[PDB]
Amino acid sequence: YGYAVSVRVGGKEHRHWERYDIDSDFLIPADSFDFVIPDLSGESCEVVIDGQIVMTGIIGSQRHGKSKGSRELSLSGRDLAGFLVDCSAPQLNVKGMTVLDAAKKLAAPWPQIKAVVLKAENNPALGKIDIEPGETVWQALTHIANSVGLHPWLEPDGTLVVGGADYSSPPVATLCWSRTDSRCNIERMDIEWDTDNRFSEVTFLLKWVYKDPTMTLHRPKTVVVDNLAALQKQAKKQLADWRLEGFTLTITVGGHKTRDGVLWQPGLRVHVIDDEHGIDAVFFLMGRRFMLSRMDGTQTELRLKEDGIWTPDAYP
Amino acid sequence: YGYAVSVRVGGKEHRHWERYDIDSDFLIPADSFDFVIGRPDLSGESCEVVIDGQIVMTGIIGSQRHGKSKGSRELSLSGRDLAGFLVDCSAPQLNVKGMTVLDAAKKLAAPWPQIKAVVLKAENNPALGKIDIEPGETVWQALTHIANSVGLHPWLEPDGTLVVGGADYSSPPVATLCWSRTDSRCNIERMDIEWDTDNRFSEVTFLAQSHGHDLKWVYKDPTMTLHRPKTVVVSDNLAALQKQAKKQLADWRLEGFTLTITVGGHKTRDGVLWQPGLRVHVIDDEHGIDAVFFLMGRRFMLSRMDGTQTELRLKEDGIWTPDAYP
Amino acid sequence: YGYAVSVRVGGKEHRHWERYDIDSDFLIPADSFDFVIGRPDLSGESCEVVIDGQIVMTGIIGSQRHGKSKGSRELSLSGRDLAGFLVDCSAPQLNVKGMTVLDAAKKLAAPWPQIKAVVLKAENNPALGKIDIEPGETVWQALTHIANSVGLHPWLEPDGTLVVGGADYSSPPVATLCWSRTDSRCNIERMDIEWDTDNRFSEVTFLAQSHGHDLKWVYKDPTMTLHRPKTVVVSDNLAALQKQAKKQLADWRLEGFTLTITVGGHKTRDGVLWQPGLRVHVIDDEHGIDAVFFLMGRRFMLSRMDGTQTELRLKEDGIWTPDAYP
Amino acid sequence: YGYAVSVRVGGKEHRHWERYDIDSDFLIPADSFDFVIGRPDLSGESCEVVIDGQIVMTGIIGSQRHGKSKGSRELSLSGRDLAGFLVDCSAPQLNVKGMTVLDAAKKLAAPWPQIKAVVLKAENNPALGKIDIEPGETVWQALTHIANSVGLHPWLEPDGTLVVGGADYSSPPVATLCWSRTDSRCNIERMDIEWDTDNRFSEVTFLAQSHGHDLKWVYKDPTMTLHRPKTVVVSDNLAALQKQAKKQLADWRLEGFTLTITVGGHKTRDGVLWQPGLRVHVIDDEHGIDAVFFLMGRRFMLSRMDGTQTELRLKEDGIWTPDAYP
Amino acid sequence: YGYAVSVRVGGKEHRHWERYDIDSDFLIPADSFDFVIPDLSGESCEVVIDGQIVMTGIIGSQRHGKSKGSRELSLSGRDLAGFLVDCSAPQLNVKGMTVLDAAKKLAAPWPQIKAVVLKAENNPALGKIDIEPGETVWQALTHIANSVGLHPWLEPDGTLVVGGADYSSPPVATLCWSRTDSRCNIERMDIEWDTDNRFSEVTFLLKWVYKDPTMTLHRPKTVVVDNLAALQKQAKKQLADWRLEGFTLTITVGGHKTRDGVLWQPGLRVHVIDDEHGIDAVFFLMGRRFMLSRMDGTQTELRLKEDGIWTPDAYP
Amino acid sequence: YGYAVSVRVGGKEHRHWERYDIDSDFLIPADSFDFVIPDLSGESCEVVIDGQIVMTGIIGSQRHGKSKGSRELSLSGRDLAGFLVDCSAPQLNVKGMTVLDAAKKLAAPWPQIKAVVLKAENNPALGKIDIEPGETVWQALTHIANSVGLHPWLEPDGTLVVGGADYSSPPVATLCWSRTDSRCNIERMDIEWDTDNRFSEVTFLLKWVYKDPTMTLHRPKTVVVDNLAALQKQAKKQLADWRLEGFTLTITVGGHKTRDGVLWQPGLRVHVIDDEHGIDAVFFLMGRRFMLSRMDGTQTELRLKEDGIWTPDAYP
Ligand SMILES: [Cl-]
Ligand SMILES: [Cl-]
Ligand SMILES: [Cl-]
Ligand SMILES: [Cl-]
Ligand SMILES: [Cl-]
Ligand SMILES: [Cl-]
Ligand SMILES: [Cl-]
Ligand SMILES: [Cl-]
Ligand SMILES: [Cl-]
Ligand SMILES: [Cl-]
Ligand SMILES: [Cl-]
Ligand SMILES: [Cl-]
Ligand SMILES: [Cl-]
Ligand SMILES: [Cl-]
Ligand SMILES: [Cl-]
Ligand SMILES: [Cl-]
Ligand SMILES: [Cl-]
Ligand SMILES: [Cl-]
């Protein structure tokens, strides 16, 4: 009669929690989990919710706390990017390599990562990417992927992807706000606009200048990014990433599933109607947090962005 | 985009509350209201409480507070419906026998022209028997006595009409409410159930003295193992003793169970303001409930923390004032 | 640098409180006190409450608590003024007619030599009429009856003197307090106003039976539209019926309005301890108030959160015990 | 590893509470219990409260609540011990003279076979005098009257036996509890002392009327300086008047002092469940206490914040029901 | 009947708030505001209180939040130093330039800053100041100004000043503490003494050594600051700045104006009497925060320093 | 009838507090204190509890706060390591020097530190340790000490030690948990396991490789540490330090003294029995916080580690 939130460690399954936070995000390298109810730290584990895999990772830390009136056991960790986030990238010449092959090679030391897949149309050969001493595997992978307009992330089953958004798939839920209409699902809504990365002119350095026509204020910027085609490619992606930073729509809904049974997952598009704020648009889900609390029960925070902006090269 | 809720006084709408509580109940005599805004002396003024242009209560502002400190100003208003007059003021020494129940009610409400109609909410309009009322009785007490003698009860309606009457269980439920931790179509925010065995007796011996204690009827539930006997004196034949004893047993039975549901908003899906006298179909698969309940009390609420809600005080179906509409 | 507040018991000063409440009121019989420090059995001991060497109350410690846990120890004391004896203990069956009011008060306080003077706080010292008191009456009840018969009221003064008397509205206001969100010279920290129409009646018929209900005086306010009649029996001529009915109307009128002001400190600017019986000029430009009010109750307070304050319970001027000093 | 606490109903153990309060007291008629878990209708069912397989109370579930919102479900149960029947139900008009106290108790508890034994907790089993009870008296009131006439008192024991009896001060204290901010062997978590002089009178004149107010005994404490006289009518010789007056003086004396100690757990070091009727040696060097106290009331408690504790309501030793075991 | 707190964005004026914090400070580069009650982010705006300009800036960020019981709109930003704080200083040789001219030149790209003024007696020519790659315009301006014993800040009308304190202007309010006397204005008082930058001997490096005579403890320091006159000038200013860090008097008063109608502003001197702590002195207001809260209404936090210590060269 | 918590500043003794935190730790450089009840900042001070010296330091900061209902005076500071933490290490060639002599020389500028002692069996000569510009005296001392398997800390009387743990001294208290048994002292217990510094293979760089046999997951690490004997010495110490980071047992007890009158102090071994969690072992106290609060009165937090792991060279 509730959500089956079924965690698996060492072939033991756990299904009953006082609270949790399970957070996935395209831009934050390693997705993470935290659960509150034997030393499980360092163990592999999986997170499923009503028959669908949600995260594959490793328990990083465990805490057992007690006082006279209470006793609690907590577990937290990250997905399998945790390895690539922590560990040093090798000296790798990826020039001429396929972005998928370079990603495969970077991930190779961790068999725990069992597939590496491309979520884009094509699989382009890479230029010379320098990897600096000290750089992590994730940093290296991000630079590589970003060089051809793509980005890395772990999927729920532990597959590493290098890819971008498919804006072709039709929105998979509609969410509305209403202080009247009880069909409406949205419990909380937070809208943020930020100007700190809007620039009036940006000079990228092989030189291309971008100028923002409606910007009346002076806010010049200069950026150090082989070919000029490789410049505007990478520069336009920087512009797109800054545009995305400038707006966030955070919606909290009850439960963990859409009104048709799909677990919220980054990558979905979501139609939002707020007749009161005058919103009727499609947004792109970039981050998603499954939450259970004593006070609010089960909810999902949905961190929604402007549609069509992120990784527009992946699938034009 | 939400509800327009006002306290209308002298044609003038007072709107924009930060919090309110509007409470109606068949058993509590005077329905009441309470409003606060936090960003003129109306005490003693006649008012109407209005939600989206529909009057939900007619009454009198009994009290007003203004409070100020550095950082806050709060104005509050409270009051009661027009039953407040009858609850406060004294019954005359009317003899009701056999004046119709509708005419003995009309009589008792006469001094308050502010109560502009008296209506019978019942199939039949019985000639009353002998009702002996004591002199410090309030109009309300007297009205309850009279009403209850014929298996009825008094209340005020939203527009200020006094009703003597009872429940109509022929009316189809107005809504189906359901509880679910996974079904988003289910809209119950909070469900509280209370069971109380205070007034659950093993045998109850009812006594009365005839026109001319010679009258005696005893009730037993063979499902009570515990010894808990009670004897009650009823104030003229085995028929009248049995009728009234049975009303007491039904009153006790109602006291034993309450289902309190909290919902967001103030209206059903088909636009009906929650109001006592409605029947509500409730489903809770977790608990195994699927039944119709009778709405005996309801509270319209606004808070900063929880926004707009209704508390629905629900009772077992078919039990209260069953004679009103057989 | 702040106030020295002590509970003096057996010449010994107990000082250094973390919190207290010292409450005086003309209408509540026994003024009270409550002290806590949080860093000897004095229960039943005689005490004086002293602020900056001035006694503000004379009474008896009724109760004491000591509480300890790891991290805190709290000692508390409560008590009442000397009216506590009269409130608790029984009146004799004195006949007062026409003993002077001052002599019937002296009589009733006689058993408590702890009350070391009885004073009349009134222009005239009327010979009392016939006052019929019932045997379980407390000295206080009896004293209130007697006092009220002649448009007076009893209280204890700070030094333990019993007063029968009333307000003096000839005394110039002792202070002007004002409210402002921009004027720093304005010193009111909190202003609460309450209006209540509970005891605001449309017509009131007063009845009494002569020496030898033949006495009847009815009051009406033509500004009441709502029907809210009341009849009151007063316990020997149209003059005495009218005098006492009017005192009841004034009591009701006082109940209908309270202005509660909170100020920092315990003294006016000219060094006067707030005390019931003072008149206070209040200005609130925001609200449109500029009037004099009569101080009926006051509470000296200390808390960790708010420090040193006084709550001032203010009433409409000129209404309470108007005969005491015409 | 902690206590197994259950509500046993129909052989079935309900365990796993998040919070409870189990309160027993010689002076409060019906001991009570309250349980909540927060992760079937048992109202009106017979139950036993059990700690580590030992029954601590026998009673009836009076009420049950289930509450649900998103994020919490809470089931609660309350009830009383078997004295609840006697407190609720009516005494017969038994004449007790001189039936033994044990036989007049047996009689009055007879209708509740649920009370399966009546025991006398006293040296002697006096033939009762003339006890005049009024008709709406409860079995409990009547039992208290009768019991108290012979310097005894009624209570229920954990297994459901009705006792008429008193304290045994020959029984050695069961435990020594001590308070210390530096001694870890000292186990008191919280110590609260209250002294109250409400019912401390200077002279008390006791009056009674003989078999055939001619009976009069007056008490004085020459340590009272304050005038606080009381007169009490007792309902047939200077011996019986003096016996009962003295019981009243002892009751008042007990009301004047309470020591409330809070301890972790529910058992003494030697495995005894805290229960009224035990004597407890208390040491607090800080306060200068080193004495034995009589346990009059006790509350087993569980909370999330404080875990498992017992509140021990302790009274001056040797004062309550001193005749029961001279 | 309250404070007219009148904010102006795009020629719309807003006057009614649930709360705000408006903070100005000589040492924190960009003053800031935050207000709680249409996308206003990136818009210019002004803050006035009862007819007197209080801050000129740009809305940096906006948030609209709502739940079932509540709805709130917040705006925050900084004064016009925000531009110079964010943006890269150019390669500028200021040698031989007047400090006012160098400040004018550094501010020139932002016409939004309409005047640049000197608040000192004279306007000295500067030495070679090196500006490092990456340094901001504010950092550069601070180094320049500091080189001649001065400091930069924005005034309420958006004028940039390079200057120092005028200790000649007489204290403009007296504030007292009293648990008795209700004429006394101070609601809260916080006094902080800190020793972390008191040194027993400081060697500045062209070498001058400072020695503290009452310092008994060993706490030596060495600092890397053209002329020797330029050394003791700049060294004595470092000593003065450390002395200032060692003591702060924070007073919270009700309202926003002195007992004669002047809005609290950094730069004023304030007589403080606390007969209870035994204080009777003049302090210099270095920072000022206008506050409105539900719980405490309108107040001002006044961050007061030792008189006469800061920028003693500006006006000897 | 309580703890005599007797602080001494300028020959004034203070004994009465609303709260305090007094924290000592082998790994955090400067132990610290904070007390809540005249400018005492910069003054030397001592902390004793019932006749036993507990900390020797310097008041770093003082605060006096008041509002209408309350007034409080706070003092905080650090032990005498505060000097060596703040100040620059000199250019010192410690090669051939005895570790005790090198420590003495590093501490010499602060006579406030009146003894420097070795808490190990022997006193080995040091190799070339380089001290970088900017390095503090404490950093230098730590590197020196660590180079020979030891560590620095200040003892309660202000003596500087370079040393390690004596695991020979028998446990000095037994602490138990019981929801029944009231003889049991433990009010709260927090157990933390963390895997972030467990590695599958560690290559130290003159090259030694460590391999963890039970580690199934790939987590390689490489570390830059004269002799090869000097490598495994220093490498094994790094391994031991990481092992210690992976587990902490935090126990809160009431009071400040063992059940035999010894003030809790880092360095003691403690037998812990938790029949409920199935713990029966000896742990090593690495950190200790004396606390007084209004809500919980006097307590000690005991930060306990795995026995025998830290500084195993000091006393084999
Ligand atoms: Cl990610
Ligand atoms: Cl599943
Ligand atoms: Cl990373
Ligand atoms: Cl009603
Ligand atoms: Cl009524
Ligand atoms: Cl509905
Ligand atoms: Cl009084
Ligand atoms: Cl009274
Ligand atoms: Cl004043
Ligand atoms: Cl009992
Ligand atoms: Cl009873
Ligand atoms: Cl014990
Ligand atoms: Cl600034
Ligand atoms: Cl203006
Ligand atoms: Cl900057
Ligand atoms: Cl340390
Ligand atoms: Cl000592
Ligand atoms: Cl360091």
TrEMBL record, chains A, E, F:
Disulfide bonds join C176-C184. Pfam families: Gp44-like_2nd, GpP-like_1st, NMB1110-like_C, NMB1110_3rd. Coiled coil: none annotated. Residues 81-163 form the Baseplate hub protein gp44/GpP-like second domain. InterPro entries: Baseplate-like_2-layer_sand (IPR023399), Baseplate_GpP (IPR026276), Gp44/GpP-like_2nd (IPR053981), GpP-like_N (IPR049354), NMB1110-like_3rd (IPR054482), NMB1110-like_C (IPR054034). Residues 241-309 form the Tail protein NMB1110-like C-terminal domain. Residues 5-79 form the Baseplate hub protein gp44-like N-terminal domain. It comes from the Bacteria. Residues 198-239 form the Tail protein NMB1110-like third domain. This is Tail protein, 43 kDa. It comes from Neisseria meningitidis serogroup B (strain ATCC BAA-335 / MC58).
